[PDB]
Amino acid sequence: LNMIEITYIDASKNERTVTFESYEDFERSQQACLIGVADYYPVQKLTYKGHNLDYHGTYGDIFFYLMKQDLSQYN
Amino acid sequence: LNMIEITYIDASKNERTVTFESYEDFERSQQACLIGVADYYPVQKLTYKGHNLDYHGTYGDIFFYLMKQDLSQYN
Amino acid sequence: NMIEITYIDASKNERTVTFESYEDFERSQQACLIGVADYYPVQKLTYKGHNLDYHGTYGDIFFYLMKQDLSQY
Amino acid sequence: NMIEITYIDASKNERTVTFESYEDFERSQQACLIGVADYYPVQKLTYKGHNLDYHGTYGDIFFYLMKQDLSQY
Amino acid sequence: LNMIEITYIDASKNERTVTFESYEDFERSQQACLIGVADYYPVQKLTYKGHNLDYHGTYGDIFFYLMKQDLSQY
Amino acid sequence: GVLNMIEITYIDASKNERTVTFESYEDFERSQQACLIGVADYYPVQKLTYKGHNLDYHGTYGDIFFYLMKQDLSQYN
Amino acid sequence: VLNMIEITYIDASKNERTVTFESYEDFERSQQACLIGVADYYPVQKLTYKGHNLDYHGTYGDIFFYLMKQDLSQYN
Amino acid sequence: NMIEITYIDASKNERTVTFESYEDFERSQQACLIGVADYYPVQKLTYKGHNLDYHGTYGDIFFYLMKQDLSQY
Ligand SMILES: [Mg+2]
Ligand SMILES: [Mg+2]
Ligand SMILES: [Mg+2]
């Protein structure tokens, strides 16, 4: 029910989780914001189709990171 | 069937249309952006459940406008 | 309402905001990093009933009022 | 003061802001493109004297309150 | 010469042209800026490997536009 | 007596001290009007000096403008 | 010459505004001080350096880079 | 790579970016209204293979380099 799930820690030191049903839903979210609220927040967990990707970096860099991964291998 | 459709004119003087499946999806998109790309753009058409609302304003003001409306009148 | 400000937004619609006191206005200036209306042209600025001859953006009102002598109104 | 919010700023000092009504709070949210305090952690959020159990940033308060059934207070 | 050429009109009504040696250079500029100075400026010409793409939009929308096009036909 | 009416020292994100000076109060006010957002606005102030007097200020660079406006500075003339 | 740099631009209310800098270094410090300058996207009606009208066509924000690329020594 | 800059981002990781010339760097500064890394601490700054004694944020590198006589190198 959720291809992409992202957990990050916000400036109040609380965990927040956002999900996207498809990859295209994630792309639309990136295109919609001039600046995302969470763009500078460290990512605690990035999962794609249930697979944990070993991502280290900010929420804002996820978009670029995803494009350079071979994603078809996750089924 | 999209519940919300918004057409606005961007800085290239081109009409752009975005859609949301639920009010919740629209609210989430508002919460996600520190600043939305389209927030200062004039709205050409705001449609809710197939009804054209009589909306004269910017994209960024839609959220506050919709919250003051009784949307139960639209079916 | 001690201060009333009318401006034109990017959809070319008139909008009006009011502040009950000068301190309410000051507080709204300190509260935003950027005000939504900061770059909007001002059509009318009213101080205690008086139409001030103001020509400029919403964001410039604060510095304008600071330099004026308001005790005469 | 129906709404009172205490938060910690970037100099590590506590600051408090108050809103006389929920509608005054809504107006302040609508007024700023970005609020100065939006990324500051909230130390206390009170509503009609009730200490709400809020854990989050100042900028997330608006969406939080919108979700709560405040009538219980 | 340059794989990507972009001409836009700035707020002084002057035409400005920027160029990128490769698509990856263009991608690097996009990732580097939180906000690019030209992002809201209308594009008058977008050229890819010498070919005028029929692009109608802002500078800021070019990246997503390019990502969706099949570029190996130029 | 003092070259600059306003001197401000703050700590940036690299944890280094930066000092800016304003020859007059008007120069400072002009600088506040000229920036939509100032680079240093969220930085803590380590020292705020007005006409050579270290004011006992605790806050961000961005909040100096409002602080000064509310102070009675007549005691410094 | 009163001020080394004089800039007139048109703000969003379509009014002419003029700012001056006594020295080039004052002008540089003002460009370092703002993350974003209020006037950066405003069109420039006149740019005067040491009393000389420069033939400047552009936005306020681009002046800094324009001046850095010019040989301004002819104006000394 | 004539200019090499290592900084630390919102997540102590180090990242390195390079520019082929001073002119290339200058163009990169003109192109962003705000650079993603502008507030990040610089851990190393190299010009033509020489480590410069730079203590500051990424965003302040430009004003630092502009004041140096780089022909020395
Ligand atoms: Mg400010
Ligand atoms: Mg971004
Ligand atoms: Mg490069």
mmCIF file of all heavy atoms in Angstrom, chain A residues 14-42:
data_model
loop_
_atom_site.group_PDB
_atom_site.id
_atom_site.type_symbol
_atom_site.label_atom_id
_atom_site.label_comp_id
_atom_site.label_asym_id
_atom_site.label_seq_id
_atom_site.Cartn_x
_atom_site.Cartn_y
_atom_site.Cartn_z
ATOM 1 N N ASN A 14 11.749 15.257 17.157
ATOM 2 C CA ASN A 14 10.716 14.246 17.009
ATOM 3 C C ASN A 14 10.734 13.545 15.654
ATOM 4 O O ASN A 14 10.966 14.161 14.592
ATOM 5 C CB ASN A 14 9.357 14.892 17.229
ATOM 6 C CG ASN A 14 9.065 15.113 18.693
ATOM 7 O OD1 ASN A 14 8.865 14.156 19.434
ATOM 8 N ND2 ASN A 14 9.047 16.368 19.118
ATOM 9 N N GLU A 15 10.455 12.256 15.695
ATOM 10 C CA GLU A 15 10.425 11.444 14.510
ATOM 11 C C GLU A 15 9.157 11.767 13.718
ATOM 12 O O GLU A 15 8.089 11.871 14.297
ATOM 13 C CB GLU A 15 10.455 9.978 14.925
ATOM 14 C CG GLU A 15 10.810 8.988 13.838
ATOM 15 C CD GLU A 15 10.723 7.541 14.329
ATOM 16 O OE1 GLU A 15 9.601 7.056 14.580
ATOM 17 O OE2 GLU A 15 11.776 6.881 14.457
ATOM 18 N N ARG A 16 9.286 11.948 12.404
ATOM 19 C CA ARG A 16 8.118 12.103 11.519
ATOM 20 C C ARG A 16 8.226 11.111 10.379
ATOM 21 O O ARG A 16 9.323 10.838 9.911
ATOM 22 C CB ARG A 16 8.012 13.518 10.939
ATOM 23 C CG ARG A 16 8.108 14.641 11.948
ATOM 24 C CD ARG A 16 6.926 14.603 12.888
ATOM 25 N NE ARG A 16 7.022 15.584 13.969
ATOM 26 C CZ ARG A 16 6.265 15.545 15.065
ATOM 27 N NH1 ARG A 16 5.379 14.556 15.225
ATOM 28 N NH2 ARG A 16 6.393 16.478 16.014
ATOM 29 N N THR A 17 7.095 10.582 9.924
ATOM 30 C CA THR A 17 7.092 9.634 8.809
ATOM 31 C C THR A 17 6.174 10.141 7.709
ATOM 32 O O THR A 17 5.054 10.551 7.993
ATOM 33 C CB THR A 17 6.652 8.220 9.254
ATOM 34 O OG1 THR A 17 7.593 7.709 10.196
ATOM 35 C CG2 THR A 17 6.615 7.262 8.083
ATOM 36 N N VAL A 18 6.668 10.137 6.472
ATOM 37 C CA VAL A 18 5.836 10.430 5.298
ATOM 38 C C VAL A 18 5.904 9.265 4.305
ATOM 39 O O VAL A 18 6.959 8.635 4.128
ATOM 40 C CB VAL A 18 6.228 11.747 4.607
ATOM 41 C CG1 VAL A 18 5.956 12.941 5.515
ATOM 42 C CG2 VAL A 18 7.682 11.740 4.174
ATOM 43 N N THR A 19 4.772 8.999 3.659
ATOM 44 C CA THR A 19 4.651 7.933 2.676
ATOM 45 C C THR A 19 4.131 8.442 1.335
ATOM 46 O O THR A 19 3.425 9.456 1.251
ATOM 47 C CB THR A 19 3.701 6.819 3.152
ATOM 48 O OG1 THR A 19 2.364 7.325 3.234
ATOM 49 C CG2 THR A 19 4.135 6.291 4.525
ATOM 50 N N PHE A 20 4.497 7.714 0.291
ATOM 51 C CA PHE A 20 4.039 8.000 -1.058
ATOM 52 C C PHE A 20 3.607 6.690 -1.670
ATOM 53 O O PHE A 20 4.322 5.687 -1.586
ATOM 54 C CB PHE A 20 5.139 8.685 -1.866
ATOM 55 C CG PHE A 20 5.549 10.004 -1.283
ATOM 56 C CD1 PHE A 20 6.619 10.088 -0.401
ATOM 57 C CD2 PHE A 20 4.802 11.145 -1.543
ATOM 58 C CE1 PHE A 20 6.977 11.299 0.172
ATOM 59 C CE2 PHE A 20 5.147 12.359 -0.974
ATOM 60 C CZ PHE A 20 6.240 12.436 -0.114
ATOM 61 N N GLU A 21 2.420 6.694 -2.258
ATOM 62 C CA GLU A 21 1.845 5.463 -2.771
ATOM 63 C C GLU A 21 2.577 4.981 -4.023
ATOM 64 O O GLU A 21 2.704 3.779 -4.252
ATOM 65 C CB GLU A 21 0.355 5.653 -3.050
ATOM 66 C CG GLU A 21 -0.350 4.343 -3.363
ATOM 67 C CD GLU A 21 -1.716 4.238 -2.709
ATOM 68 O OE1 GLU A 21 -2.453 5.252 -2.688
ATOM 69 O OE2 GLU A 21 -2.046 3.137 -2.211
ATOM 70 N N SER A 22 3.067 5.920 -4.822
ATOM 71 C CA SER A 22 3.812 5.589 -6.024
ATOM 72 C C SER A 22 5.004 6.498 -6.140
ATOM 73 O O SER A 22 5.127 7.493 -5.409
ATOM 74 C CB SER A 22 2.936 5.750 -7.262
ATOM 75 O OG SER A 22 2.564 7.111 -7.439
ATOM 76 N N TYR A 23 5.876 6.162 -7.080
ATOM 77 C CA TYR A 23 7.038 6.978 -7.358
ATOM 78 C C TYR A 23 6.609 8.323 -7.932
ATOM 79 O O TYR A 23 7.227 9.361 -7.663
ATOM 80 C CB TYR A 23 7.969 6.267 -8.337
ATOM 81 C CG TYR A 23 9.346 6.872 -8.391
ATOM 82 C CD1 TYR A 23 10.339 6.447 -7.524
ATOM 83 C CD2 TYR A 23 9.654 7.879 -9.299
ATOM 84 C CE1 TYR A 23 11.606 7.000 -7.562
ATOM 85 C CE2 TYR A 23 10.921 8.439 -9.346
ATOM 86 C CZ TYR A 23 11.891 7.996 -8.474
ATOM 87 O OH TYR A 23 13.156 8.534 -8.509
ATOM 88 N N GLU A 24 5.549 8.296 -8.731
ATOM 89 C CA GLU A 24 5.049 9.511 -9.365
ATOM 90 C C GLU A 24 4.451 10.464 -8.322
ATOM 91 O O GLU A 24 4.585 11.675 -8.464
ATOM 92 C CB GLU A 24 4.032 9.178 -10.456
ATOM 93 C CG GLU A 24 4.635 8.447 -11.666
ATOM 94 C CD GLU A 24 4.940 6.964 -11.439
ATOM 95 O OE1 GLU A 24 4.508 6.380 -10.418
ATOM 96 O OE2 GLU A 24 5.623 6.366 -12.297
ATOM 97 N N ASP A 25 3.789 9.932 -7.295
ATOM 98 C CA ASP A 25 3.352 10.762 -6.166
ATOM 99 C C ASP A 25 4.529 11.460 -5.494
ATOM 100 O O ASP A 25 4.408 12.609 -5.062
ATOM 101 C CB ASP A 25 2.596 9.943 -5.119
ATOM 102 C CG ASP A 25 1.170 9.638 -5.534
ATOM 103 O OD1 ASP A 25 0.512 10.544 -6.074
ATOM 104 O OD2 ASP A 25 0.698 8.503 -5.308
ATOM 105 N N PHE A 26 5.668 10.776 -5.395
ATOM 106 C CA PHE A 26 6.858 11.381 -4.794
ATOM 107 C C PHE A 26 7.407 12.496 -5.702
ATOM 108 O O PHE A 26 7.757 13.590 -5.225
ATOM 109 C CB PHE A 26 7.919 10.305 -4.502
ATOM 110 C CG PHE A 26 9.231 10.857 -3.989
ATOM 111 C CD1 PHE A 26 9.307 11.442 -2.733
ATOM 112 C CD2 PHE A 26 10.387 10.772 -4.757
ATOM 113 C CE1 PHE A 26 10.504 11.960 -2.259
ATOM 114 C CE2 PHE A 26 11.586 11.279 -4.286
ATOM 115 C CZ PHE A 26 11.647 11.869 -3.036
ATOM 116 N N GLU A 27 7.470 12.236 -7.009
ATOM 117 C CA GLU A 27 7.930 13.253 -7.957
ATOM 118 C C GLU A 27 7.051 14.508 -7.912
ATOM 119 O O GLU A 27 7.573 15.628 -7.887
ATOM 120 C CB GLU A 27 7.978 12.693 -9.386
ATOM 121 C CG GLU A 27 9.094 11.685 -9.613
ATOM 122 C CD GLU A 27 9.203 11.234 -11.059
ATOM 123 O OE1 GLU A 27 8.155 11.021 -11.705
ATOM 124 O OE2 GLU A 27 10.343 11.100 -11.546
ATOM 125 N N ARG A 28 5.726 14.327 -7.870
ATOM 126 C CA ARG A 28 4.802 15.481 -7.777
ATOM 127 C C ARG A 28 5.052 16.317 -6.524
ATOM 128 O O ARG A 28 4.987 17.550 -6.583
ATOM 129 C CB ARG A 28 3.322 15.063 -7.827
ATOM 130 C CG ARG A 28 2.790 14.820 -9.233
ATOM 131 C CD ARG A 28 1.284 14.568 -9.239
ATOM 132 N NE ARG A 28 0.928 13.222 -8.784
ATOM 133 C CZ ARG A 28 0.906 12.129 -9.553
ATOM 134 N NH1 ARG A 28 1.227 12.189 -10.847
ATOM 135 N NH2 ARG A 28 0.564 10.955 -9.023
ATOM 136 N N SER A 29 5.357 15.658 -5.403
ATOM 137 C CA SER A 29 5.661 16.370 -4.162
ATOM 138 C C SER A 29 6.949 17.186 -4.290
ATOM 139 O O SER A 29 7.070 18.266 -3.707
ATOM 140 C CB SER A 29 5.759 15.396 -2.980
ATOM 141 O OG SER A 29 6.952 14.612 -3.043
ATOM 142 N N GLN A 30 7.927 16.672 -5.032
ATOM 143 C CA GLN A 30 9.185 17.388 -5.199
ATOM 144 C C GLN A 30 8.988 18.614 -6.089
ATOM 145 O O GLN A 30 9.522 19.685 -5.799
ATOM 146 C CB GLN A 30 10.257 16.441 -5.734
ATOM 147 C CG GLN A 30 10.716 15.453 -4.667
ATOM 148 C CD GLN A 30 11.519 16.137 -3.575
ATOM 149 O OE1 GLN A 30 12.281 17.055 -3.853
ATOM 150 N NE2 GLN A 30 11.341 15.713 -2.341
ATOM 151 N N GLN A 31 8.203 18.457 -7.147
ATOM 152 C CA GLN A 31 7.944 19.542 -8.074
ATOM 153 C C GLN A 31 7.062 20.637 -7.449
ATOM 154 O O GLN A 31 7.192 21.801 -7.822
ATOM 155 C CB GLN A 31 7.280 19.017 -9.354
ATOM 156 C CG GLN A 31 7.046 20.114 -10.385
ATOM 157 C CD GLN A 31 6.974 19.612 -11.822
ATOM 158 O OE1 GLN A 31 6.453 18.528 -12.097
ATOM 159 N NE2 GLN A 31 7.496 20.414 -12.751
ATOM 160 N N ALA A 32 6.204 20.265 -6.499
ATOM 161 C CA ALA A 32 5.228 21.202 -5.919
ATOM 162 C C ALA A 32 5.823 22.234 -4.967
ATOM 163 O O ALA A 32 5.259 23.321 -4.836
ATOM 164 C CB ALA A 32 4.119 20.440 -5.201
ATOM 165 N N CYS A 33 6.897 21.893 -4.247
ATOM 166 C CA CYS A 33 7.494 22.804 -3.318
ATOM 167 C C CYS A 33 8.666 23.541 -3.922
ATOM 168 O O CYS A 33 9.542 22.943 -4.535
ATOM 169 C CB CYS A 33 7.982 22.109 -2.029
ATOM 170 S SG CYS A 33 6.741 21.111 -1.197
ATOM 171 N N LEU A 34 8.672 24.854 -3.738
ATOM 172 C CA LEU A 34 9.874 25.632 -3.972
ATOM 173 C C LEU A 34 10.948 25.187 -2.967
ATOM 174 O O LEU A 34 12.094 24.898 -3.338
ATOM 175 C CB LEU A 34 9.564 27.119 -3.836
ATOM 176 C CG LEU A 34 10.709 28.063 -4.217
ATOM 177 C CD1 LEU A 34 11.126 27.825 -5.652
ATOM 178 C CD2 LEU A 34 10.296 29.502 -3.959
ATOM 179 N N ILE A 35 10.549 25.114 -1.711
ATOM 180 C CA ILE A 35 11.349 24.543 -0.635
ATOM 181 C C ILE A 35 10.424 23.686 0.225
ATOM 182 O O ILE A 35 9.362 24.148 0.655
ATOM 183 C CB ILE A 35 12.009 25.615 0.275
ATOM 184 C CG1 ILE A 35 12.918 26.552 -0.518
ATOM 185 C CG2 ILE A 35 12.832 24.955 1.376
ATOM 186 C CD1 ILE A 35 13.380 27.754 0.269
ATOM 187 N N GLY A 36 10.809 22.432 0.453
ATOM 188 C CA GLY A 36 10.080 21.558 1.367
ATOM 189 C C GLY A 36 10.404 21.863 2.823
ATOM 190 O O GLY A 36 11.553 22.184 3.157
ATOM 191 N N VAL A 37 9.409 21.749 3.699
ATOM 192 C CA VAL A 37 9.587 21.995 5.135
ATOM 193 C C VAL A 37 10.744 21.149 5.677
ATOM 194 O O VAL A 37 11.565 21.625 6.444
ATOM 195 C CB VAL A 37 8.288 21.705 5.921
ATOM 196 C CG1 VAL A 37 8.482 21.833 7.435
ATOM 197 C CG2 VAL A 37 7.175 22.642 5.472
ATOM 198 N N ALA A 38 10.801 19.903 5.230
ATOM 199 C CA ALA A 38 11.737 18.888 5.775
ATOM 200 C C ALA A 38 13.076 18.751 5.032
ATOM 201 O O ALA A 38 13.880 17.894 5.403
ATOM 202 C CB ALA A 38 11.051 17.539 5.783
ATOM 203 N N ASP A 39 13.343 19.599 4.034
ATOM 204 C CA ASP A 39 14.469 19.383 3.113
ATOM 205 C C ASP A 39 15.836 19.250 3.778
ATOM 206 O O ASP A 39 16.668 18.520 3.271
ATOM 207 C CB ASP A 39 14.551 20.500 2.063
ATOM 208 C CG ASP A 39 13.480 20.363 0.957
ATOM 209 O OD1 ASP A 39 12.666 19.434 1.011
ATOM 210 O OD2 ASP A 39 13.455 21.224 0.058
ATOM 211 N N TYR A 40 16.056 19.936 4.894
ATOM 212 C CA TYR A 40 17.360 19.882 5.588
ATOM 213 C C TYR A 40 17.438 18.864 6.744
ATOM 214 O O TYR A 40 18.463 18.786 7.431
ATOM 215 C CB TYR A 40 17.756 21.266 6.094
ATOM 216 C CG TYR A 40 18.323 22.164 5.000
ATOM 217 C CD1 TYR A 40 17.505 23.016 4.273
ATOM 218 C CD2 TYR A 40 19.661 22.142 4.705
ATOM 219 C CE1 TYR A 40 18.029 23.840 3.291
ATOM 220 C CE2 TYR A 40 20.217 22.959 3.715
ATOM 221 C CZ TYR A 40 19.398 23.807 3.018
ATOM 222 O OH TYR A 40 19.927 24.614 2.041
ATOM 223 N N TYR A 41 16.380 18.086 6.930
ATOM 224 C CA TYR A 41 16.316 17.114 8.024
ATOM 225 C C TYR A 41 17.018 15.794 7.694
ATOM 226 O O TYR A 41 16.900 15.261 6.572
ATOM 227 C CB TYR A 41 14.872 16.842 8.396
ATOM 228 C CG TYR A 41 14.156 17.963 9.108
ATOM 229 C CD1 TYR A 41 12.780 18.126 8.971
ATOM 230 C CD2 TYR A 41 14.835 18.831 9.958
ATOM 231 C CE1 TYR A 41 12.111 19.124 9.647
ATOM 232 C CE2 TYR A 41 14.172 19.816 10.651
ATOM 233 C CZ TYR A 41 12.816 19.960 10.488
ATOM 234 O OH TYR A 41 12.177 20.936 11.208
ATOM 235 N N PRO A 42 17.752 15.250 8.677
ATOM 236 C CA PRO A 42 18.408 13.980 8.447
ATOM 237 C C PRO A 42 17.390 12.857 8.354
ATOM 238 O O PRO A 42 16.414 12.828 9.099
ATOM 239 C CB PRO A 42 19.327 13.813 9.682
ATOM 240 C CG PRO A 42 18.678 14.626 10.748
ATOM 241 C CD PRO A 42 18.014 15.780 10.031
#
